[PDB]
Amino acid sequence: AILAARIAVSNLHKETKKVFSDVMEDLYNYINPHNGKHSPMVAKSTLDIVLANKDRLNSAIIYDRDFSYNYFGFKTLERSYLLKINGKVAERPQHMLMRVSVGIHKEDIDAAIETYNLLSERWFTHASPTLFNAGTNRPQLSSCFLLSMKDDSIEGIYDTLKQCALISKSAGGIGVAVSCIRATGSYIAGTNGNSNGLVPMLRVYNNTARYVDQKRPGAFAIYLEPWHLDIFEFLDLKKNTGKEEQRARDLFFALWIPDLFMKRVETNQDWSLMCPNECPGLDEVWGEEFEKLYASYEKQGRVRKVVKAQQLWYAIIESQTETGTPYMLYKDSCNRKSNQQNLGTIKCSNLCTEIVEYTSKDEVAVCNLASLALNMYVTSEHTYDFKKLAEVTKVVVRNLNKIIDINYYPVPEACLSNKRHRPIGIGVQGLADAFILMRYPFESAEAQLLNKQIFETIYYGALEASCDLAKEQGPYETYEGSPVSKGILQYDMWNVTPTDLWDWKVLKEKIAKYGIRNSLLIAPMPTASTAQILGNNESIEPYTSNIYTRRVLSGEFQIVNPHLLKDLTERGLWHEEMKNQIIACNGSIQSIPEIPDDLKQLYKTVWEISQKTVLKMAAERGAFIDQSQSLNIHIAEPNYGKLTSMHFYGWKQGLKTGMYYLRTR
């Protein structure tokens, strides 16, 4: 299990060259056998730099560090992350890592080697696209894009479609605000007919996601505000039951929900469905300005239908019960608590619901992501190295900022947006793993403090780097007029006062003289592929299991949690019988009578951990997060009241993203 990883790392080493620069030459020199077309697999510019510096570069690589990958982490590396020559891997992990670092840092060889070390030791990681394409010809290094529908017209709709198509091709995830498109049955002046509405146009988007699928199908998340008249239909179209023309199951679904709707639901008032043609401008305002405008149309009776707000609500909950979706975002908090509110109202988040960025017809938002491994900063004295964490966080910020400049953009609107506001999104993995390492259960008061200190540190480290860059490079163009320019920082907009761990007075004074380089910095994302690679538990998120199991070609694996295992082995209580005992407990200790009630607390599973405390923790770290978090909700046995109970708590806590996916048993 641990051994098979050693073998597979060694075989690979046996079947690839050892010299980094010589591997780079082979990739660059690659020739299409069918064709004779010289089809370089790294950019020439990267290779020149490598060859000009081959002694430092080749020498700096430490191939011991290939052996840090666990088995399935490695297999995944070999399947998608290591460049192949005619179906044979050419690249060692270390080789790809060096490629990524030279690819980001170019001629600054010091900066490159620091990054290689940091990466190769697994202090952090860049997201998959940037691992895939750094050091490569016309390299698309960004994970996600967000789009506001261009125009409420066929010219507009198919223009956006082409953008989504081009972004899909280049490996971008998409989030799209569709709320301006006019409702089913609304009048069309120039042809004197009526709109077929949202469903039939989303059907075209759905086929486009299927068609442009380079190996998972294209991923588009569609954003609807609940005042729009097609809402009930929009909740139907994910479901596995019903008419084909009424469905779009390859798409993803999210609600961009105003405060006003939530208040109507709890007070049990009436909700007014509208058409954006009839009642324009609702998505371009938020909070009180929205509510005044929403009320205005309502007093005029420009209202296509009215319903019990509690009727919509039930429609949403059954969707989540059946489908796991839609995602729950609160437009008012997102807008209220944004360093970008400077630029206008923000109409959607992205595919994974952690990114909150402005878009318009001239602007497709982007975000480059990397993630810090939180387990990494636990000392052997069970101390947490906040100083180090901020050390590494500052590197990441600079890297991500370098990415903005060298990225190749699939559409010009995205280039403009990204160099205008220079947002980035740093996230995390192994938040659970850190806790176990510090001997804190997830729900303990110590974990709840740690949680805040970690995210205070990262946000502190981040701003501090961004600040230095504004020193060297200057502020981003739209810095002036922003909350941060006005001395307001993210915790201030949540009305929180930081722990005394870091001196914000200093920083708020550094930022006042120089400004910052990046409009936004922090956004915990899902990390599904990158956490499996590095063997850390997903982003935030309690441990799912003490046991991970997998049927492979040569039978099965049953990998007990490494953190648990070292501890039972130590407190000499480990047995092979306990392995099969756990499986019956579906991942859980708690039942096994032979195990310490101290350990049992520490390795409690996700299905056995308070979702309220989860929400409370998101909210507490949320105050140190510029953007949002891809927060799943685990409720084994859902019902109407539970989900309702959960959503309102999330909302009242002031979460920008109340729920990402709903997971059940």
Ligand SMILES: Cc1ccc(F)c([C@@H](C)[C@H](NS(=O)(=O)c2ccc(Cl)c3c2OCCN3C)c2n[nH]c(=O)o2)c1C
């Ligand atoms: C306020 C709140 C927030 C989020 C949330 F998910 C929920 C419930 C739907 C949610 N229901 S539940 O998951 O089935 C559940 C229901 C009841 C209990 Cl006692 C627990 C529980 O979760 C796991 C262990 N605990 C403490 C819950 N989390 N924490 C809690 O006290 O209840 C509530 C009541």
Ligand SMILES: Cc1cn([C@H]2C[C@H](O)[C@@H](COP(=O)(O)OP(=O)(O)OP(=O)(O)O)O2)c(=O)[nH]c1=O
């Ligand atoms: C022409 C057409 C438009 N539509 C939808 C797309 C948009 O939501 C909306 C407007 O389409 P447009 O292309 O704007 O139609 P138009 O310019 O002729 O009308 P207007 O002067 O009212 O702008 O109607 C259909 O659903 N089916 C159709 O066949």
Ligand SMILES: [Mg+2]
């Ligand atoms: Mg028109």
